[PDB]
């Protein structure tokens, strides 16, 4: 059984450079290498195969080149839409047909500030018994944020979920939701709701909030 | 026009059994193997096996011998594999790849994928509840920002797809990860609506459509 390893494993660039990711086997497989590409939840697709050959519709600034040991494949000027995991796979001793660990992509640009939207609970969703309030911070870089709920200037902890997106396809960057929840009963209980959005685009934290029932 | 469809997303409980679909298309099917492989949340690719969907021939890899089986039905140009005794470290994504060539066998087409989940909860269609915002200073030259809210849905393969009241599509469809919460997920969908139009339209609302495994879904989202 022969083992592809993938070299770096994370990789950053921005816009408009040369990547090269490195493919290495613990034994000669001659030019019996394809490379696949993966984006967030989708399935692989076959850039390269036998090496040095390009599928056609691929884009031409992708190239493979290698043979024996060491493999390369190469993205010539890299581009938003490139954000994804690489993979290379082996077809010289089958089976088992063994891939790489994969080589994750991640696309450096400069800072962007997060636009905050507060969200209060529907009056159906308040019928349920339950109360969820919802922040949502879009397009922003890097990746680092905080998002801090307040009830009646009360710091909440333990009550939200957040959840933040993989870079954009386009803009390369990231979009975060944080969730708020409470029973109806105590959604009911207090008056004034906010998220505050800490990220370095921000020249200081801003703070979003709504009145219950004031909506 | 080569495409490979595969079934949809499933929770079974621990020592259960699953079969998963590849129907495929724009091709002899017959003529080009079928491989499994296998993607566990966060980790890479696994390969599981082939079948000849031609002899019907099969050959598994050594982790699966005993537990996998691989089928064909030629008439209905579908595949099939089916995985018993199921483990949490079974719960990913599996499609089917075809594979060309006879020297340097590349899998050129792949499948959509097929989420498994292997856990002791039950499976449930999402319910949808809008999200309108309320802001202490609107501005009228600013986007206006809309959502939907999917709750109590198991598999976590939810899709959400928005159209506008004249029933055209929308194609501002921000996505974010689901989130894992009493054995069942919840996810949010957003939609900015730019003011030239909000403010020279008259429609009321936006419809927040979902598809689930168990279920599809759909709900109004208010304009404000
Ligand atoms: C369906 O509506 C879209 C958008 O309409 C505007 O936005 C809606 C949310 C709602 O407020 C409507 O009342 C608004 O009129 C139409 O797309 C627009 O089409 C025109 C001309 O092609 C173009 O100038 C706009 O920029 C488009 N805007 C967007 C966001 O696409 C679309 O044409 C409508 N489809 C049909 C069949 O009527």
Redesign the interface.
């Known amino acids: 059984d022969i083992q592809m390893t993938q070299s770096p494993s994370s990789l950053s660039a921005s816009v408009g450079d040369r990547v090269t990711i490195t493919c290495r086997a613990s034994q000669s497989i001659s030019?019996?290498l394809?490379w696949?590409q993966q984006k967030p939840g989708k399935?692989?697709?076959?850039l390269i195969?036998?090496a040095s050959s390009l599928?056609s519709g691929v884009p031409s600034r992708f190239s493979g080149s290698g043979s024996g040991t060491d493999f390369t494949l190469t993205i010539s000027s890299l581009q938003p839409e490139d954000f994804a995991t690489y993979?290379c796979?082996q077809?010289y001793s089958?089976?088992?047909?063994?891939?790489?660990?994969?080589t994750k992509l991640e696309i450096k640009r400069t800072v962007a500030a997060p636009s905050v939207?507060?969200?209060?609970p529907?009056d159906?969703?308040l019928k349920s018994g339950t109360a969820?309030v919802?922040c949502?911070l879009?397009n922003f870089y890097p990746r680092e944020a905080k998002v801090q709920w307040k009830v009646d200037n009360a710091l909440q902890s333990g009550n939200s979920?957040e959840?933040?997106?993989e870079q954009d396809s386009k803009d390369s960057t990231y979009?975060?939701?944080s969730?708020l929840?409470l029973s109806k009963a105590d959604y009911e209980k207090h008056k004034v709701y906010a998220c505050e959005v800490t990220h370095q685009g921000l020249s200081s934290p801003v703070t979003?909030?709504?009145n219950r029932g004031?909506? | 026009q080569v495409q490979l469809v595969q079934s949809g997303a499933e929770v079974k409980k621990p020592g259960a059994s699953v079969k998963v679909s590849c129907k495929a298309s724009g091709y002899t099917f017959t003529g080009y193997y079928m491989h499994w492989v296998r993607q566990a949340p966060g980790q890479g690719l696994e390969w599981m096996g082939w079948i000849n969907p031609n002899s019907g021939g099969t050959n598994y890899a050594q982790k699966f011998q005993g537990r996998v089986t691989m089928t064909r039905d030629t008439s209905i140009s579908t595949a099939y594999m089916e995985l018993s005794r199921l483990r949490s470290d079974d719960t990913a994504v599996y499609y089917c790849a075809r594979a060309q060539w006879l020297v340097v066998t590349n899998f050129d087409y792949w499948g959509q994928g097929t989420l498994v989940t292997v856990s002791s909860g039950s499976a449930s269609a999402p319910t949808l509840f809008p999200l309108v915002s309320c802001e202490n200073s609107p501005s009228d030259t600013s986007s206006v920002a809309v959502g939907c809210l999917a709750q109590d849905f198991l598999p976590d393969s939810i899709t959400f797809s928005w159209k506008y009241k004249n029933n055209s599509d929308i194609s501002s469809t921000r996505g974010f990860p689901s989130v894992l919460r009493g054995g069942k997920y919840a996810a949010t969908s957003q939609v900015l609506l730019p003011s030239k139009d909000v403010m020279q339209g008259t429609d009321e609302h936006v419809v927040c459509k979902v598809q689930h495994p168990n279920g599809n879904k759909e709900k109004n989202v208010p304009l404000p």
């Open positions: 030019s019996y394809n696949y399935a692989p697709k076959l195969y036998a599928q993979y796979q077809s089958t089976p088992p047909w063994t891939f790489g660990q994969g939207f507060i969200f209060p529907s159906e969703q969820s919802v949502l879009n979920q959840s933040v997106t979009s975060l939701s969730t929840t979003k909030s709504f004031e909506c």
